From Swiss-Prot:
Its main location: mitochondrion. The gene is FKS1. There is a cross-link at K206 (Glycyl lysine isopeptide (Lys-Gly) (interchain with G-Cter in ubiquitin)). Residues 1-274, 321-338, 392-428, 507-1094, 1185-1188, 1262-1281, 1334-1341, 1467-1503 are cytoplasmic. It is found in: Mitochondrion; Cell membrane. Component of the 1,3-beta-glucan synthase (GS) complex, composed of two alternate catalytic subunits FKS1 or GSC2, and a regulatory subunit RHO1. Interacts with RHO1, which is a GTP-binding protein. It comes from the Eukaryota. This is 1,3-beta-glucan synthase component FKS1. It catalyses: [(1->3)-beta-D-glucosyl](n) + UDP-alpha-D-glucose = [(1->3)-beta-D-glucosyl](n+1) + UDP + H(+). It comes from Saccharomyces cerevisiae (strain ATCC 204508 / S288c).
């Protein structure tokens, strides 16, 4: 019989017959499609049934009306206010606070709904539901539905439709008002070609999407732009006849783009404008204070001028924003007003600084200098504090007039946030106060106060040296100032890493203190969880407090504890003797004869779980989760009905049979069974035994099919894993009320029948099987099999039909089939419903439009949406009605929302809860467990809010389906198609909370739109928390990588300068004996010691930030290993060992993030191998010139970067596989064959030449000899040595290239060989000429090479890009020049890589250890082929020895190139050149000089 909570009562305001009457009439007079009417009717009635099982039926209808259309939660009310009667500013004013006007209209609206007869509310809701059901693929645009809904509602109330004695034909609401909008959307992509559609490839910024499609309807002036077909405006017409001619509007002259994103670096300045301000500005002031080398008023004046940078940053953000919104669109004048205000602020700030900067040089004004300095210091501080807070999108809004728009974005649709009151408010305040009060305090004593001494030295010391021939000694005269500038620049970056460093520390402290203070789970009282289980189950999983008839509080627990255990055994996890001691046995009372209840000995105080199998894990976790304070549940008779969605494109329903054996030694290992059998060798044992009892044929094949199916990874395991929701309800139904079984005790069939009837109305399952009309006949059998297995299952699939007349698109439907539908002659079952779409719905990339077409059949109140790989064990399935109570809607009181008084200040249900994420963070001896518990949290809490912000598991269906959809996927917008739903619900009113006693069981977006709305309007509480989770992580891995490069640039110069000095011996105790004992010397010892204080502070940030991803990637073991690992270091190298114990994880992780040599090289290059190569060279130059002690710390790390991927490879290292890998490498090498425009050319030039010049400066200084006491006419003219060696090899390229053209004019593979043959030797030769030029001095030769390489790539970097910007004969040469020159570079770098393994192949037994190492990491079903024919063996040995000799030859010539000039360094003694007149002393002047003119000498000049 039908819905037994609305009909089976006697106080229902209406009758089920009246509802059908209303639906029939409403369909009749608007032409809705006939079957969707039945669908929506069933949906509505099920909704009423569910809502009326925990309240009076008089209130269910009221609550539904309030929630859909009319309450403070309904979307229709929001749109009606914001558009139909303006009043958008008032909502923003009221939000920031926490006749006409807002109170009056609100009162009128509230009092106009308080007097509706209960037969009108049903009509309203029915109309809305019908409109929502019909509109295909327009559900993504909420406000459109509101517009059509209002138009239809106004039309039906007219005296024009009530007198017309004729109903419009069916399909008149889909072929007249809905289809044109769809034709507009599909016409922005998929341009029609001669017969079909193809993906129209337009630029990503001329394509209107959904977000730009509905956003027209937010503003009153956005509606007034709807031109009709003739030319008149739609609004011009009266209200009643505004619906009929809605099919004549042309939706192609009426939609614009309204966002138009731009270059990526340009957003990060307007979005996150509060992080640059609080960092740059304060950073300025610190150095401005303690830098007296440029009285007492100048100091304060400068530190005050520090405050003028904040306003400048605000102005360049406002000005940058002006290129996002359109020109005349709503909210544009506010930008000009704000620009005016900010200009005034900037003027006020930097007005008087000029007056105090120089107007006081010993005149009578000094009485008025200090006062203005101090007051403007205070003003600057006030400005900084004001701009660090008060979001950019809302300031200077009180001082504005009425105007038209006082805000730039709608404040009722993108600025409605949850106020987050309670206790967590103070906690967030405290956290973000301590972080920034610790960082600003410690980053002044370790980073600006310890840098105070070198500033005085390196800013006054003046060099004395001859110089060069083109400018003399004007550039080399001030080297130290450049070093100081580079030191400050490379230290400015670390100020940004410091914050994220402290944010990790203070979070985990606050978590431990909060999880220990509240006295929850003190350390580990482990021998108590099992001791007191029964009191946990009886009051957390059973609802007895409101069940009464209290009797026997232990017979109930017995009925449960056996069910959970037996289920484990039925899955072949426990032995038959292994369960009898793990179950409530009942023993008869020997006194009288009746039965009594015992308890397992395990359960009060012998291998309960075999070799800690997973069966232990399931029980263990279940036992701990009952300590958390779970809310008390409701009776299983009064819970809401929910549903489950699953999308499925193309998976495996079953592993078939032929794909179980296949061929053995043709792929990984052997037949699949034996692979599966070995992994679980305690189940197959129990399995075959279970077969024997059953056998005590196709069924056996089926049983093997299922047995394998439950393992591996398929679709059958998810369905059978989630269908435990069905049993968990039934079992808890009988237990709760045992008087229901006494009624018909003896009817075993009657009992089970009733139990099923309940579970089929509180739980629905639905999968969305796309493309089901075109399955292969071998795969269609699998689909039908599921229907036979679980009859209560629902499948939704698309369909087709030949076109009505020849030449048109075929109509497509979307029908569902149940498990009880009768079969037809064809074989497929007859569907229950069949709805008509308006064209192909699949338009996006991912599986997000798959969900939408099957969302119509979602009967229920809440939704749990899953992918096709989940487990959901039964023990984590019993407590479903406790997690479902997180939505605070189960224990409340109704208050008649339409009531006089009760203004919107003191209501309760204002921000409903939308998403509920689930638990995902799965988990000296006494000290070790405590410490390992602490290290657990630091790993734990790092991802507690990084991969857990919007990950959805349960969705409040009513709230989340009226405003948008469940997920969106478009070519234009790009977030992740998974996090988009999370952010959208936050900035629209909803709220997100997550439980912690459940098992989920599972940049290109900084360019997006939601980042613009979130980062410009959020308060500072939530902004900082938001910034340091998603954006501040990716933007942190870029600063560390950028800090390293800025460190190499300053290392080169610092060591170069250190290779020229006397250093004035220095003591690190208290060197205040200002005597400077070399007398005539200039000291640089403190500057050199700065390298020591940096390396320490750069691996700490590398340490803490890369420890928490260890355990979240290597939780598997370690505690057992830690004992022996500690056992090997009670007397080991300790602090230094920690250094070399902290350099391996980088090798470990990147290996897991990742075979012939060439194919691995080509994909691992361009990001890790090249930048590492250059940085390797610069470090080498430094380590030879001065050799600071703690410099090898980089040698380990930099080596590990480019030496790890070639040690974590599989068996490829023995003897000849190495050499045969050398076969194809050469063969592959032989056949490798590889203002709107003033922004792209500026972004890829500036930070590619600065790095070049910095190297170039160093080379000039190292040649200009200092302390040499020579004359003016000496010079070196070292600039030329760059030119003679930088462009000369490029000239050799073209000359041969032209001669290549000529020779053929006056074999292609051969011609490549000779071309590439000399393209390599030319560079190798020019490496030699540079060495000779510097008179055979290795130290001052390296820096020469480094400069040339940087200079070379600068030419290529700019020349190619400009040519692309801007001819064919010119361009065709360009690519050929760059290609072959780049070739020689890749050859040498590639070749040297496989040369540094010679002292690893000499060891006889090598891969044996290599095998042991890698198999520890992971097993991958290894296979070893013994395929070596007699003729293969001889040739294999034959050909391998061919290149094994060749390999050694190229090794010898490379070393020979080195030793050549090295041994010729004692043969030339006179000189190498004596030319003059511009090339004078060109090669290198000295052969014998001195650099120690100090001591006795008092005053010489040595210019
Ligand atoms: C003395 C012998 C060497 C002569 C080297 C001639 C380079 C000639 C110019 C060139 O090829 O310079 C670079 C490549 O530099 C390098 O290999 C630098 C490392 C060299 C290690 C030598 C070890 C002995 C091009 O880099 P890309 O533009 O490819 O970088 C963007 C991503 N595609
Ligand atoms: C005030 C600080 C300015 C820092 C500018 C750094 C620019 C980037 C230098 C390195 C670019 C990449 C070189 C390969
Ligand atoms: C009662 C007022 C409390 C204000 C808390 C502000 C916290 C700001 C943190 C960041 C400062 C730069
Ligand atoms: C007269 C002395 C001028 C010194 C200028 C130093 C500029 C350093 C810039 C560093 C940029 C990374
Ligand atoms: C006072 C003499 C100044 C000579 C020019 C200095 C240019 C420095 C440029 C630094 C770029 C990193
Ligand atoms: C003021 C800082 C501007 C942001 C710099 C971002 C550099 C990386 C862009 C990819
Ligand atoms: C804007 C700078 C104001 C300076 C005031 C000076 C007054 C001088 C009075 C003698
Ligand atoms: C919060 C970090 C503080 C570090 C110490 C600063 C004061 C040192 C005084 C000796
Ligand atoms: C967290 C703020 C700590 C402030 C310490 C001030 C310096 C220590 C005393 C010299
Ligand atoms: C001249 C000092 C050389 C020190 C060793 C350089 C190479 C280190 C490789 C680990
Ligand atoms: C001039 C001092 C050189 C010290 C070299 C130390 C070598 C350590 C190799 C690991
Ligand atoms: C010794 C004080 C220097 C200036 C500190 C400014 C702090 C601003 C928050
Ligand atoms: C560093 C100043 C950048 C200014 C960009 C202006 C862009 C206007 C469209
Ligand atoms: C001698 C009186 C000086 C007053 C200066 C006032 C400055 C206000 C910004
Ligand atoms: C010579 C020191 C004068 C300090 C004046 C301070 C005024 C603060 C309002
Ligand atoms: C931001 C206030 C604390 C840091 C500056 C004052 C103390 C310096 C030692
Ligand atoms: C970036 C934080 C540096 C902390 C250095 C502490 C040194 C202790 C010996
Ligand atoms: C302060 C502006 C810096 C712009 C750098 C652009 C880099 C693009 C890759
Ligand atoms: C560190 C800022 C010094 C500014 C001096 C201006 C003359
Ligand atoms: C722009 C800061 C320096 C001003 C100098 C005025 C004499
Ligand atoms: C000398 C005191 C140092 C304290 C360091 C705390 C991190
Ligand atoms: C006299 C100007 C010299 C500029 C040198 C730039 C590298
Ligand atoms: C010469 C005064 C210091 C200059 C620093 C530039 C960053
Ligand atoms: C300080 C910003 C530097 C950006 C460098 C981009 C390569
Ligand atoms: C006449 C100045 C020449 C400068 C050359 C810089 C590469």
């Amino acid at each position: 019989e039908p819905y037994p909570a609305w009909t089976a009562d006697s106080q229902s305001p209406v009758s089920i017959e009246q509802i059908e009457d209303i639906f029939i009439d409403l369909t009749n007079r608007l032409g809705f499609q006939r079957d969707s009417m039945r669908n929506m009717f069933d949906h509505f009635m099920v909704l009423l049934d569910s809502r009326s099982s925990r309240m009076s039926p008089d209130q269910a209808l009221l609550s539904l009306h309030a929630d859909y259309i009319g309450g403070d939660t309904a979307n229709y009310k929001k749109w009606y206010f914001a558009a139909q009667l303006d009043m958008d500013d008032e909502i923003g004013f009221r939000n920031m606070s926490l006749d006409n006007s807002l109170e009056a209209a609100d009162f009128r609206w509230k009092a106009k709904m308080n007097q509706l007869s209960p037969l009108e509310r049903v009509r309203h809701i029915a109309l809305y539901l019908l409109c929502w059901g019909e509109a295909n693929q327009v559900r993504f645009t909420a406000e459109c539905l509101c517009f059509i809904y209002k138009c239809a509602l106004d039309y039906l109330d007219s005296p024009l439709c009530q007198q017309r004695q004729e109903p419009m034909p069916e399909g008149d609401f889909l072929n007249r008002v809905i289809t044109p909008i769809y034709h507009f959307i599909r016409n922005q992509v998929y341009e029609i070609v001669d017969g079909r559609f193809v993906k129209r490839e337009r630029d990503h910024n001329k394509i209107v999407g959904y977000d730009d499609l509905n956003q027209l309807f937010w503003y009153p002036e956005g509606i007034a732009k709807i031109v009709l077909e003739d030319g008149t405006k739609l609004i011009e017409l009266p209200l009643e006849e505004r619906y009929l001619r809605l099919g004549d509007v042309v939706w192609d002259d009426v939609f614009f783009k309204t966002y138009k994103e731009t270059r990526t670096w340009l957003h990060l300045v307007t979005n996150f404008n509060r992080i640059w301000v609080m960092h740059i500005s304060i950073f300025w002031m610190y150095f401005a204070y303690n830098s007296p080398t440029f009285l007492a008023a100048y100091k304060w004046a400068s530190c005050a001028l520090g405050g003028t940078v904040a306003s400048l940053i605000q102005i360049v953000a406002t000005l940058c924003e002006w290129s996002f919104v359109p020109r005349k669109w709503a909210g544009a004048q506010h930008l000009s007003r704000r620009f005016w205000f900010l200009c005034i602020i900037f003027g006020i700030n930097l007005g008087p600084i000029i007056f105090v900067f120089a107007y006081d040089k010993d005149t009578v004004y000094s009485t008025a200098a200090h006062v203005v300095a101090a007051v403007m210091f205070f003003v600057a501080v006030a400005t900084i504090i004001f701009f660090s807070i008060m979001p950019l999108g809302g300031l200077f809004t009180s001082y504005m007039k009425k105007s038209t728009r006082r805000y730039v974005a709608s404040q009722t649709f993108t600025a409605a946030f949850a106020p987050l009151h309670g206790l967590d408010r103070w906690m967030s305040y405290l956290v973000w106060v301590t972080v920034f009060a610790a960082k600003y305090s410690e980053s002044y004593y370790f980073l600006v106060l310890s840098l105070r001494d070198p500033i005085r030295i390196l800013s006054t010391t003046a060099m004395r040296c001859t110089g060069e021939y083109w400018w003399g000694a004007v550039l080399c005269k001030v080297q130290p100032k450049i070093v100081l500038g580079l030191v400050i620049a490379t230290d400015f970056i670390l100020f940004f890493l410091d914050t994220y460093l402290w944010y990790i520390i203070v979070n985990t402290i606050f978590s431990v203190g909060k999880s220990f203070y509240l006295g929850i789970s003190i350390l580990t009282p482990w021998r108590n969880i099992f001791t007191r289980l029964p009191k946990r189950i009886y009051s957390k999983i059973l609802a007895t407090t409101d069940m009464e008839i209290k009797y026997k509080p232990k017979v109930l627990i017995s009925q449960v504890w056996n069910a959970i255990i037996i289920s484990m055994y039925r899955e072949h996890l426990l032995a038959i003797d292994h369960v009898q001691k793990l179950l409530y046995h009942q023993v008869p009372s020997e006194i009288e004869g009746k039965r009594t209840l015992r308890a397992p000995t395990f359960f009060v105080s012998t291998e309960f779980f075999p070799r800690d199998s997973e069966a232990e894990r399931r029980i263990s976790f279940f036992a701990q989760s009952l300590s958390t304070p779970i809310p008390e549940p409701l009776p299983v008779d009064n819970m809401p009905t929910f549903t489950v969605l699953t999308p499925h494109y193309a998976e495996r329903i079953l592993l078939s049979l032929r794909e179980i054996i296949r061929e053995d030694d043709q792929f990984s290992r052997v037949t699949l069974l034996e692979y599966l059998k070995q992994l679980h060798p305690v189940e197959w044992e129990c399995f075959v035994k279970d077969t024997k009892i059953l056998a005590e044929a196709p069924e056996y094949t089926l049983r093997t099919r299922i047995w394998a199916s439950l393992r591996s990874q398929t679709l059958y395991r998810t369905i059978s894993g989630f269908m435990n929701y069905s049993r968990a309800i039934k079992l808890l139904y009988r237990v709760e009320n045992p008087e229901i079984v006494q009624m018909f005790g003896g009817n075993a069939e009657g009992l089970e029948r009733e139990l099923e009837k309940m579970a089929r109305r509180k739980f629905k399952f639905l999968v969305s099987m796309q493309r089901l009309a075109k399955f292969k006949p071998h795969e269609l059998e699998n689909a039908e099999f599921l229907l036979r297995a679980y009859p209560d299952l629902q499948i939704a699939y698309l369909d087709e039909e030949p076109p009505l007349t020849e030449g048109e698109e075929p109509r497509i439907y979307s029908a569902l089939i149940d498990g009880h539908c009768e079969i037809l002659d064809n074989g497929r079952r007859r569907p229950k419903f069949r709805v008509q779409l308006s064209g192909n719905p699949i338009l996006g990339d991912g599986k997000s439009d798959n969900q939408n077409h099957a969302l119509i059949f979602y009967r229920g109140e809440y939704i749990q949406l899953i992918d096709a790989n989940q487990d959901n064990y039964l023990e984590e399935c019993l407590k479903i009605r406790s997690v479902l109570a997180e939505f605070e809607e189960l224990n409340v009181e109704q208050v008649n929302p339409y009531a006089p008084g009760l203004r919107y200040e003191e209501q309760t249900t204002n921000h409903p809860v939308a998403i509920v994420g689930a638990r995902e963070y799965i988990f000296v001896a006494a000290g070790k467990e405590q410490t390992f518990g602490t290290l657990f949290a630091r790993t734990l809490s790092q991802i507690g809010g990084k991969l857990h912000y919007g990950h959805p598991d349960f969705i409040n269906a009513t709230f989340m389906t009226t405003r948008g959809g469940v997920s969106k996927a478009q070519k234009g917008l790009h977030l992740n198609e998974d996090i988009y739903a999370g952010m959208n619900a936050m900035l629209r009113g909803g709220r997100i909370k997550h439980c912690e006693y459940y098992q989920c069981g599972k940049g290109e977006q900084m360019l997006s739109r939601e980042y613009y709305y979130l980062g410009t309007q959020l308060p500072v509480d939530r902004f900082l928390t938001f910034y340091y989770a998603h954006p501040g992580f990716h933007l942190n891995n870029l600063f560390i990588q950028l800090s390293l490069q800025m460190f190499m640039l300053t290392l080169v110069n610092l060591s170069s300068l250190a290779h020229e000095s006397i250093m004035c011996i220095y003591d690190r105790n208290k060197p205040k004996t200002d005597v400077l004992v070399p007398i005539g010397c200039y000291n640089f010892q403190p500057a050199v010691d700065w390298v020591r204080r940096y390396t320490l502070s750069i691996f700490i940030v590398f340490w803490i930030a890369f420890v928490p991803i260890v355990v979240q990637e290597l939780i598997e073991r370690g505690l057992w290993k830690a004992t022996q690992r500690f056992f090997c270091h009670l007397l080991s190298l300790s602090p230094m060992f920690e250094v070399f114990a902290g350099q391996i994880y980088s090798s470990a992780l990147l290996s897991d993030l990742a075979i012939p040599f060439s194919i691995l090289y080509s994909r691992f290059a361009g990001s890790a191998i090249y930048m590492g190569a250059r940085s390797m060279l610069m470090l080498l130059f430094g380590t030879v010139a001065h050799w600071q002690a703690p410099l090898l710390w980089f040698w380990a790390s930099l080596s590990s970067l480019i030496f790890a991927p070639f040690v974590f490879n599989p068996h490829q290292f023995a003897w000849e596989d190495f050499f045969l890998d050398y076969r194809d490498y050469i063969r592959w090498l032989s056949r490798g064959n590889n203002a709107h425009r003033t922004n792209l050319i500026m972004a890829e030039i500036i930070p590619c030449a600065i790095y070049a010049a910095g190297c170039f400066i160093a080379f000039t200084f190292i040649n200009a000899q200092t302390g040499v006491k020579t004359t003016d006419d000496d010079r070196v003219n070292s600039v030329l040595r760059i030119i003679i060696c930088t462009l000369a090899p490029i000239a050799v390229n073209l000359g041969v290239l032209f001669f290549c053209m000529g020779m053929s004019c006056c074999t292609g593979s051969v011609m490549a060989g000779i071309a590439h043959g000399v393209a390599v030797i030319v560079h190798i030769a020019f490496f030699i000429v540079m060495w000779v030029l510097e008179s055979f001095n290795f130290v001052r030769m390296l820096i020469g090479v480094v400069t040339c390489i940087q200079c070379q790539r600068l030419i290529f970097h700019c020349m190619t890009a400009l040519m692309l910007t801007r001819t064919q004969p010119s361009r065709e040469l360009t690519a050929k020049v760059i290609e072959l020159s780049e070739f020689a570079a890749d050859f040498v770098l590639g070749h040297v890589i496989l040369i540094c393994q010679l002292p690893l192949i000499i060891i006889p037994k090598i891969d044996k250890f290599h095998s042991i190492m890698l198999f520890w990491l992971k097993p991958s079903r290894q296979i070893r082929p013994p395929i070596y024919s007699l003729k293969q063996t001889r040739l294999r040995k034959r050909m391998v020895k061919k290149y094994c000799s060749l390999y050694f030859l190229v090794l010898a010539i490379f070393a020979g190139c080195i030793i050549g000039p090295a041994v010729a360094s004692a043969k030339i003694h006179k000189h190498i050149g004596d030319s003059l007149d511009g090339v004078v002393h060109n090669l290198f002047q000295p052969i014998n000089t001195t650099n120690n003119d100090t001591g006795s000498q008092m005053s010489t000049y040595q210019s």
